Design a protein around this nucleic acid. Structure first.
Ligand SMILES: Cc1cn([C@H]2C[C@H](O)[C@@H](COP(=O)(O)OP(=O)(O)OP(=O)(O)O)O2)c(=O)[nH]c1=O
Length: 1265
RNA sequence: GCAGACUGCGUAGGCGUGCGCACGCCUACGCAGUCUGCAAAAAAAAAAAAAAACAAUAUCGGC
DNA sequence: GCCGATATTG
């Protein structure tokens, strides 16, 4: 073990290309510590020095752009800083700390070029107290220490002798001279003097020499000065993870195909089982990927390799003898190396910039991680230990964590008889024979390939490096081998030993003290193939889960939505409020460390008791046979500690198995008649909640809660399911204070007299406070959450997407959970804050009406929270119409009236004089909203094509229910299928059969009703989209989106369109076709949202012109902000301005140079409204980019007397060109890109001179140079 | 010259209250009218994907 | 419809 410390005088870091190339070179050297001098960064520019892959970066920056220092410590180096001193001018930075329990004192110094020894001595006197036997003084000393440090071999000056004396008194020595007494190497070459000299030195105490390993001066072309690289011995491999980018090269892809094929053609035979063969293939592919990555790195910089080899040989020749022609050749080849490295670094940085440009403002990773605060460092370094100690020692903290989790997962409680007794007491659903054989059906390549295709991307790999992009890429050839492996696994029931491998990582629990070990959630990364097998099993069991779990559970269950329970719970609480005798309670049980306290033997026993037997259960038992988990703590893979209990918390199959296991407890609670839950109408609602979270409602708590605790204790004893009774709240209701007190006594639960947080919702003790506890906070939160974004660096489009991404999901979730009649003040406040954020505390530049309108209007669909609220509220009508027996949440309401009538009211008569209850919280408001929408559509909502066969019309025909059952089971469910008029029972042979099968009285009743003229006309008319939205769809997926789109269409205000105003001030009527074309162009002018944002801003008259400012300020100066002396109308500023005209004239010179005779029409560039006769999109693709570049050019200098120069337009065009080039290469759209850019590149290259393009880095990309 | 706030006029729908009318609230709505952040923009931001998984749900968009 | 991305609950 050695510590590599590197020092370098980079002579400024302003050049980004030089920054990264030093950052790429420093990556190659892999130093343990790096000291950098003359960063040319200010305290304001500390943001600039942000390098990926390195976190602990300490900076000392001066005010001016002359100095500034920083120290980089390798992530492989565990330096624990204690005290830091920084120079206000960057000449020095002090840092005291320890490395691996070895104290280390590091000093960085940049002495002035003149009189450095005196300045250094002053630093020594100031830091005399800080020097110890572990001192490292670094930086730019600006002086040589010995005669051998100068090429001229000139005597060390008297200042050096005094400086050396000062170092000697401080027991500090020149390490390089000590370790290389006879080395005459030098770091900097002085061109004016033609002399080499070693003026940067590594100085430390002699005691460190025993630790010192090796020091060397590494001549480099990245800077005039060479770095000194010292290795320091300390008292004594990471996991390989495949890189997605590696798969993008064709050569490596073909090589991997060939390697896979040759392996499975060579290593296949009878003597080996397919599991061990698969593991061997994994290892071989791992080694092959490592080797081919090395080969790819070699080839990619092979030119650099040969050039640096030539430089090494010629530099050795120079050192042994220096020659003038050798000097000039060395200089030329060094320039060649610089140009090649600049080429590669520009490639890399522009590829990154293109990636950002393609996602600059979209709702995507860049925006999501811009909005989110800087990630809190999950790398733990000190935790309140078991007894009382905070602790910091890495090995002791690792031991604490590892032992904690090893003890957590090492418990099976082998008491199978007790598990049998518990399971054979609460009869629970069993899968029929058909479903059993469905689970055990053979694995099909179609199934595996479907899983692979659905396999999430951009996900961390498991203990093996393969990252689920590897399987997708080699899907076509791997899938057969995966199928063979799964066939072997199902036949034999033994998994490859690599399947059990998993990597636990400790993610902090939000809102919890990270210093406690117990507050970390261990999430598991599993081998992707193991995850494929587990996803297969999870999908298999999921095909039958609906009948396997009661609808009380809505966590991890397809098609069930969490808000169900919320509404249910709230209804229950409302009932409690309305009850005369309030003797009841609700408890929010929260499982402690669920998925980890689950006992695998009990889970397997439950699955066996469920009828899951055979191949599927064999594989389930195998996957839990010998699971293992390594804890990747601080990047170190700790020991294995096989987890004897719990279910892997990152496994696809774990949620389903946990739900199945806890369904046993749910069934037990429901069966127990002495745990009587609240009774609403004709339904019993004992308990319902997400997977591990449970909420129970109980009557007569004194006894029911005690019985519940007894049952939970039995379940915990039998299965390990433990509840943290302390962190498990409850509302208690009793009409006697003494009863409340004694219940508090017996019950071990903490009674929350105000509220309970529950699925992100503040359930309120009294429902009347719901809003005050749920929306008023949320609204306030949004305000706060947006106030910290006041200065967020995003454009109005970026802010709109930020709202849509961060606030909208939160607001919609709140609406879904609590669709109570919200006062309009809430929506006014929410819209006000949202808009104010979007326009950063200024007046909205674009009309809210324009943006709110659909994307057809060219905008970005500024979300309308009022319409989202209405959509969410009216959504419940879908469940009303469906009348599902599982949505018990809907039927739990005040029962003043016959509660059964809710599935009605949708496409059936209104029960005039019949009230739904003043106490109704959700359904009454949904009814009001649904009626409002139906009235707005001016449709009849009581008899429609989708009226169910039995809602009230047939019922009001006093039809026997058996007749309704016959009609339902024969033909369909809607009146339409029955038919009306001529078509009554006259459209299918089954219709005739039913017509014959009904009794004469009911038959004639249906004849009288259906064939009536009014019903015929009201049922036959084609159904509107709003009705298909609640009848045609049998699934509630995407329902809010569809309802909101329909509402958007319905409530589409007639706004003051700004394209029409462009027509007006251009005195030229635009045809509807012209408006449509302008909107289409604004929609698809470019993929990147910066280009589209520019086009949208120009089209929507975003830029406020001197006319606007004159009117608002009432000042008469309408003169354009350029000295043009004309009126400052928008068309002037964009098109008609003598200072803006030359740019458009140049653009038209380019157009004609492109053999394009297009009219000199402002509409074409400013809006894309091409003349009707001109429709050749081939040239439009280029013209759009040319025009938008011109628009950017004008906008940048939108108000300066400065003329938008041609060169600015060229530069912006090339910016777009490079971004699109790399984006297309990554997206494989290269042919279209060349088609739309080749001629333009040719003209641009011809127009410019070599000097100008070189200065602006305008080297061609499509064509070689 | 865009928009919201907001005064008033007023259409219609609903809910609650009172004895066809009156009151209170809300919705959607057009009109006239006062403002009102204001320099001017491009700041560059980096904003970084890349590590920390899993199930389900919702949203958005592009194809 | 798919196919990416984001948040919501665990
Ligand atoms: C929050 C979260 C939960 N889960 C799963 C694993 C958990 O066992 C299960 C329930 O989570 P929670 O109930 O939210 O957490 P918990 O009950 O395990 O924590 P505590 O013991 O302190 O109450 O959901 C994840 O897989 N990933 C996650 O990020």
């Amino acid at each position: 073990s050695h510590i590599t410390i590197l020092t370098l005088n980079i002579n400024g870091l302003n050049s980004a290309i030089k920054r990264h190339r030093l950052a790429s070179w420093i990556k190659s050297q892999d130093p343990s510590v790096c000291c950098i001098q003359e960063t040319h960064l200010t305290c304001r520019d500390t943001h600039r020095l942000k390098i990926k892959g390195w976190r602990k970066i300490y900076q000392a920056n001066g005010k001016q752009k002359k100095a500034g220092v920083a120290i980089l410590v390798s992530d492989k180096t565990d330096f624990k800083p204690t005290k830091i001193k920084r120079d206000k001018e960057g000449h020095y930075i002090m840092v005291k700390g320890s490395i691996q329990q070895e104290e280390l004192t590091i000093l960085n110094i940049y002495a002035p070029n003149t009189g450095a020894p005196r300045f250094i001595k002053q630093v020594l006197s100031d830091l005399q107290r800080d020097l110890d036997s572990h001192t490292l003084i670094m930086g730019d000393f600006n002086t040589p220490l010995s005669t051998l440090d100068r090429s001229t071999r000139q005597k060390v000056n008297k200042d050096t002798q005094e400086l050396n004396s000062a170092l000697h008194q401080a027991d500090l020595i020149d390490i390089y001279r000590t370790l290389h007494p006879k080395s005459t190497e030098y770091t900097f070459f002085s061109a004016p003097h033609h002399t080499y000299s070693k003026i940067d030195h590594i100085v430390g105490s002699k005691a460190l020499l025993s630790k010192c390993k090796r020091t060397e001066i590494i001549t480099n072309y990245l800077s005039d000065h060479s770095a000194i690289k010292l290795e320091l011995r300390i008292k004594n491999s990471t996991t390989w993870k495949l890189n997605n980018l590696l798969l993008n090269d064709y050569w490596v892809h073909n090589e991997m195909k060939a390697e896979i094929k040759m392996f499975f053609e060579t290593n296949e035979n009878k003597d080996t089982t397919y599991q061990n063969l698969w593991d061997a293939f994994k290892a071989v592919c791992r080694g092959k990927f490592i080797a081919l990555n090395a080969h790819k790195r070699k080839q990619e910089r092979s030119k650099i390799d040969t050039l640096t080899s030539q430089l090494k040989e010629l530099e050795k020749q120079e050192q042994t003898h220096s020659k003038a022609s050798r000097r000039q050749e060395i200089t030329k080849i060094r320039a060649e190396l610089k140009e090649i490295e600049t080429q590669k670094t520009l490639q890399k940085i522009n590829e990154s910039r293109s990636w950002f440009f393609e996602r600059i403002n979209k709702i995507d990773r860049p925006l999501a991680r811009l909005i989110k605060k800087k990630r809190e460092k999950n790398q733990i370094d000190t935790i309140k230990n078991d007894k009382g100690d905070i602790t910091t020692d890495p090995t002791e903290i690792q031991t604490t964590i590892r032992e904690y989790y090893k003890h957590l997962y090492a418990n099976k409680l082998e008491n199978l008889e007790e598990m049998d007794k518990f399971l054979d007491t609460y009869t629970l659903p069993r899968l029929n024979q058909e479903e059993v054989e469905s689970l055990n059906r053979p694995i099909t390549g179609s199934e595996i390939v479907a899983i692979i295709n659905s396999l999430p991307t951009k996900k961390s790999p498991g203990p093996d490096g393969f990252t689920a992009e590897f399987y997708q890429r080699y899907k076509e050839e791997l899938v057969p081998f995966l199928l063979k492996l799964f066939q072997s696994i199902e036949k034999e029931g033994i998994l490859p030993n690599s399947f059990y491998e998993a990597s636990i990582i400790l993610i902090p629990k939000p809102g919890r003290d990270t210093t406690k070990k117990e507050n970390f959630r261990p999430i598991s990364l599993m081998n992707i193939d193991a995850k494929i097998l587990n996803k297969i099993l999870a999908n298999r069991i999921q095909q039958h889960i609906k009948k396997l779990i009661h609808h009380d559970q809505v966590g991890f269950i397809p098609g069930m939505q969490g808000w169900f329970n919320i509404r249910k719970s709230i209804n229950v609480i409302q009932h409690i409020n309305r009850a005369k005798d309030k003797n009841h309670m609700i408890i929010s049980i929260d499982a402690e460390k669920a998925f980890d306290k689950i006992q695998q033997p009990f889970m397997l026993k439950t699955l066996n008791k469920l009828g899951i037997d055979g191949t599927y259960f064999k594989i389930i038992r195998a996957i839990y046979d010998k699971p293992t988990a390594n804890i990747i703590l601080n990047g170190q893979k700790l020991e294995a500690f096989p987890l004897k209990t719990g279910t892997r918390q990152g496994c696809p199959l774990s949620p389903l198995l946990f739900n199945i296991v806890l369904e046993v407890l749910a069934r037990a609670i429901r069966q127990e008649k002495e745990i009587k839950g609240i009774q609403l109408g004709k339904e019993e609602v004992k308990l319902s909640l997400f997977a591990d979270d449970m909420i129970v409602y109980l009557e007569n708590p004194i006894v029911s809660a005690q019985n519940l605790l007894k049952l939970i204790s039995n379940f915990s004893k039998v299965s390990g399911y433990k509840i943290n009774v302390q962190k498990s709240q409850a509302f208690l209701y009793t009409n006697n204070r003494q009863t409340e007190s004694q219940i508090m006594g017996e019950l071990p639960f903490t009674i929350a007299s105000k509220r309970i947080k529950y699925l992100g919702i503040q359930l309120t003790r009294d429902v009347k406070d719901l809003f005050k506890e749920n929306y008023k906070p949320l609204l306030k939160e949004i305000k706060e959450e947006t106030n910290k974004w006041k200065n967020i660096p995003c454009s109005w489009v970026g802010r709109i997407n930020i709202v849509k991404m961060a606030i909208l999901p939160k607001v919609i979730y709140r609406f879904n959970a609590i669709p109570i009649k919200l006062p309009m003040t809430f929506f006014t406040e929410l819209e006000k804050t949202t808009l104010k954020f979007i326009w950063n505390q200024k007046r909205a530049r674009i009309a809210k009406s324009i943006l709110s309108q659909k994307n057809k209007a060219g905008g970005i669909t500024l979300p309308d929270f009022k319409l989202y609220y209405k959509a969410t509220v009216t959504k419940t009508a879908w469940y009303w119409y469906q009348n599902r027996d599982i949505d018990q949440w809907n039927r739990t309401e005040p029962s003043e009236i016959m509660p059964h009538i809710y599935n009605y009211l949708i496409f059936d008569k209104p029960e005039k004089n019949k009230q739904w209850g003043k106490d109704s919280l959700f359904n009454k408001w949904c009814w009001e909203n649904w009626l409002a929408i139906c009235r707005k559509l001016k449709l009849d909502p009581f008899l429609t094509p989708y009226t169910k066969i039995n809602s009230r019309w047939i019922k009001d025909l006093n039809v026997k229910p058996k007749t309704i059952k016959t009609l339902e089971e024969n033909l369909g469910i809607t009146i339409q299928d029955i038919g009306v008029g001529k078509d009554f029972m006259s459209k299918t042979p089954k219709a005739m059969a039913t017509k014959d099968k009904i009794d004469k009285w009911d038959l004639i009743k249906l004849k009288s009703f259906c064939t009536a003229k009014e019903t015929t006309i009201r049922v036959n008319r084609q159904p509107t989209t709003w009705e298909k939205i609640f009848a045609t769809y049998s699934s509630d997926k995407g329902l809010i989106s569809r309802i909101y789109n329909e509402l958007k269409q319905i409530y589409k205000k007639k706004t003051n369109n700004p394209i029409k105003k462009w027509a007006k001030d251009m005195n030229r009527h635009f045809s509807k076709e012209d408006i449509y074309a302008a909107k289409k162009h604004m929609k698809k002018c470019s993929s990147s949202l910066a280009i589209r944002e520019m086009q949208i801003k120009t089209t929507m008259r975003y830029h406020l012109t001197p006319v606007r400012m004159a009117i608002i300020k009432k000042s008469g100066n309408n003169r354009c902000w350029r000295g043009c002396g004309e009126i400052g109308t928008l068309l002037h500023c964009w098109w008609d301005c003598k200072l803006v005209q030359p740019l458009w004239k140049s653009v038209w010179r380019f157009l004609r140079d492109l053999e394009l005779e297009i009219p000199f029409d402002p509409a074409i560039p400013l809006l894309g409204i091409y003349p009707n006769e001109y429709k050749s999109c081939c040239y439009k693709d280029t013209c759009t980019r040319m025009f938008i570049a011109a628009l950017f050019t004008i906008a940048k200098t939108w108000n300066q007397p400065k003329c938008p120069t041609m060169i600015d337009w060229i530069k912006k065009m090339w910016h777009i060109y490079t971004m699109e080039y790399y984006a297309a290469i990554k997206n494989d759209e290269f042919i279209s890109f060349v088609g739309t850019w080749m001629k333009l590149e040719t003209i641009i290259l011809s127009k410019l001179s070599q000097e100008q393009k070189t200065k602006h880095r305008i080297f061609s990309l499509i064509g070689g140079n």
